[PDB]
Design a protein around this nucleic acid. Structure first.
Ligand code: ZN
Ligand code: ZN
Length: 65
DNA sequence: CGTGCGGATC
DNA sequence: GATCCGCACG
């Protein structure tokens, strides 16, 4: 496309991952993960951060554009 | 067992 | 703003 052949868009990372600059497991089903019992991707893990895709599911979902 | 950082390209 | 990616140390 344009920037899809270099990186990004593989599984969208956590809040702390975007700010820590790190890819991870917590995918588009991180929620369904908690459902099947998730915990914390490799990031939130090493830094006991906050594996979150919630504020996210409501952060990017809100507002227009 | 945590710790952070430069970049693709819009 | 977003996601991807590794790595070298104690
Ligand atoms: Zn993550
Ligand atoms: Zn996480």
């Amino acid at each position: 496309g344009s920037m899809a052949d270099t990186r990004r868009r593989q599984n969208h990372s956590c809040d702390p991952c975007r700010k820590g600059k790190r890819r991870c497991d917590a995918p588009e089903n991180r929620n369904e993960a908690n459902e099947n019992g998730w915990v914390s991707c490799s990031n939130c893990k090493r830094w006991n951060k906050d594996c979150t895709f919630n504020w996210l599911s409501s952060q990017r979902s809100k507002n227009s554009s």
